[PDB]
């Protein structure tokens, strides 16, 4: 997260870290056995770390659980990034508390202008690199689809939504993928892609979660 702030300890209890040796992506806990992330965050082996604040220090509130099932959206395109969503079933149900909690799926699609919270342990610099120890947060609005399309000519599908600022300065970055975009208590977006980070006229692009509520519910019930 570039241009954000350090989240208050465990103020984003649904945020998880996907780890396969080192932190490589984020995710969101949607129920005690399932996490939703980005399809490009797929790895054959994934360990989910919940209740994290400082990913580099054992704090005492963390829960480490391995991924038992990893299911990418059947229509995911690794080049256009359309349908960039993935579900992870945990090997065992996690213990829910004030530091490890679920986030609700969208009740409907949120309109442009809705303010949201983006979070993750990704790079905090637009130029160069700085991997933060502490979870970063960013308040940003869902942008009008017309502005998203103007910023990314011919690359935006109906399954994508731009969140951020046309003037740049604040955005999600490498290491944030798969992470949450929560608006009014609902998971409306998943960190997906963008050209650079926090660059003017190139706000981050996110998977529009409201288009996948049924796919998520059907997949969970069938696995």
């Amino acid at each position: 997260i570039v241009g954000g702030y350090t989240c208050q300890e465990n103020s984003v209890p649904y945020q998880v870290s996907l780890n396969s040796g080192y932190h490589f992506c984020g995710g969101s806990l949607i129920n005690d056995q399932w996490v939703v992330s980005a399809a490009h965050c797929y790895k054959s082996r994934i360990q989910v770390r919940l209740g994290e604040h400082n990913i580099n220090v054992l704090e005492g509130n963390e829960q480490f659980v391995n991924a038992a099932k990893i299911i990418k959206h059947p229509n995911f395109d690794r080049k256009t990034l359309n349908n960039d969503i993935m579900l992870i079933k945990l090997s065992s149900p996690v213990k829910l508390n004030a530091r490890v909690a679920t986030v609700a799926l969208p009740s409907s699609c949120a309109p442009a202008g809705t303010q949201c919270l983006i979070s993750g342990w990704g790079n905090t610099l637009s130029s160069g690199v700085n991997e933060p120890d502490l979870l970063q947060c960013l308040d940003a609005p869902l942008l009008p689809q017309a502005d998203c399309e103007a910023s990314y000519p011919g690359k935006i599908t109906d399954n994508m939504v731009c969140v951020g600022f046309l003037e740049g300065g604040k955005d999600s970055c490498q290491g944030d993928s798969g992470g949450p975009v929560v608006c009014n208590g609902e998971l409306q977006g998943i960190v997906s892609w963008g050209y650079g980070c926090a660059l003017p006229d190139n706000p981050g692009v996110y998977t529009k979660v409201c288009n996948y509520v049924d796919w998520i519910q059907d997949t969970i019930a069938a696995n």
Binding site: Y22, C25, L81, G122, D176, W193
Partner: protein, 58 residues
Amino acid sequence: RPDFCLEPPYTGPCKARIIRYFYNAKAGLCQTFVYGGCRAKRNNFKSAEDCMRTCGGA
């Protein structure tokens, strides 16, 4: 050596943090960089050995 070996490491548009290897022509060896997870260019390898074999030259 191949042309792609001389290009700077390409993170790409995706926002994951995937450690990959690339050939650093100035240094004369392969080093690590952060790959975003999609649309990789050719100077991107999963191992230092594969990188040096492909871009090490002679």
